[PDB]
Amino acid sequence: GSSGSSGSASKRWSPPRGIHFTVEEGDLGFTLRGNTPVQVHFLDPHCSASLAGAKEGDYIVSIQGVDCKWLTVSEVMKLLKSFGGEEVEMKVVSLLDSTSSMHNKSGPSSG
């Protein structure tokens, strides 16, 4: 095991979660947007993945053990489809990064 050393300036991802559900080869209830790692854009609350115990913006890392960190949307989609109607184990990690920031303002117009 290990913890770390020195203040290495670099992004940090959370730990991978363990989801348990049965893919749906008809209505996943969600989609995959972006490039990679693809995220979970829950479209339906009564979907499946969500009902399992997932969240939004969930970045899939692996599916049943498969590597889904570089894979895109098509890939994963297939990696998921393949496991249609089969209880798989999806792992997602949360992204941590600064947020909010000051910006310039604008002025209204007359009439």
Curated annotation (Swiss-Prot):
It is found in: Cytoplasm, Perinuclear region. Residues 17-95 form the PDZ domain. Transmembrane segments: none annotated. Belongs to the RHPN family. Interacts with GTP-bound RhoA and RhoB. Interacts with both GTP- and GDP-bound RhoA. Interacts with KRT18. Binds specifically to GTP-Rho. May function in a Rho pathway to limit stress fiber formation and/or increase the turnover of F-actin structures in the absence of high levels of RhoA activity. This is Rhophilin-2. It comes from Mus musculus (Mouse).
